From Swiss-Prot:
The chain holds residues 1 to 89 of 161 of the full protein. Cardiac muscle Tn-C can bind 3 calcium ions per molecule. Domain I does not bind calcium. GO terms for molecular function: actin filament binding; calcium ion binding; calcium-dependent protein binding; protein homodimerization activity; troponin I binding; troponin T binding. It is linked to Cardiomyopathy, dilated, 1Z: A disorder characterized by ventricular dilation and impaired systolic function, resulting in congestive heart failure and arrhythmia. Patients are at risk of premature death. Cardiomyopathy, familial hypertrophic, 13: A hereditary heart disorder characterized by ventricular hypertrophy, which is usually asymmetric and often involves the interventricular septum. The symptoms include dyspnea, syncope, collapse, palpitations, and chest pain. They can be readily provoked by exercise. The disorder has inter- and intrafamilial variability ranging from benign to malignant forms with high risk of cardiac failure and sudden cardiac death. Keywords: Acetylation, Calcium, Cardiomyopathy, Disease variant, Metal-binding, Muscle protein, Phosphoprotein, Repeat. Disulfide bonds: none annotated. This is Troponin C, slow skeletal and cardiac muscles. Changing A8V: In CMH13; increases calcium sensitivity of the myofilaments. The keyword Phosphoprotein applies.
Amino acid sequence: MDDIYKAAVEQLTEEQKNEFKAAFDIFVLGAEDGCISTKELGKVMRMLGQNPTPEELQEMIDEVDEGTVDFDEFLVMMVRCMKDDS
Ligand SMILES: [Ca+2]
Ligand SMILES: [Ca+2]
């Protein structure tokens, strides 16, 4: 696991990770695909209750990405987004 990610991901409980994975899995054919599209990214985040803004999604893509998002990148983006609730 990339070490920066390791402590965004330490904010999440095992149960949150499992829930997040079940949503993510809806948007891939997991038997052959490990990434969702950048278009799908906001859809999975909204499925999980987050409401990222269009400028934010591009920003997270620029800052987190290693047009695609895999599961650990997705976890980091969820953790970032969870911190902008009001
Ligand atoms: Ca739960
Ligand atoms: Ca559930």
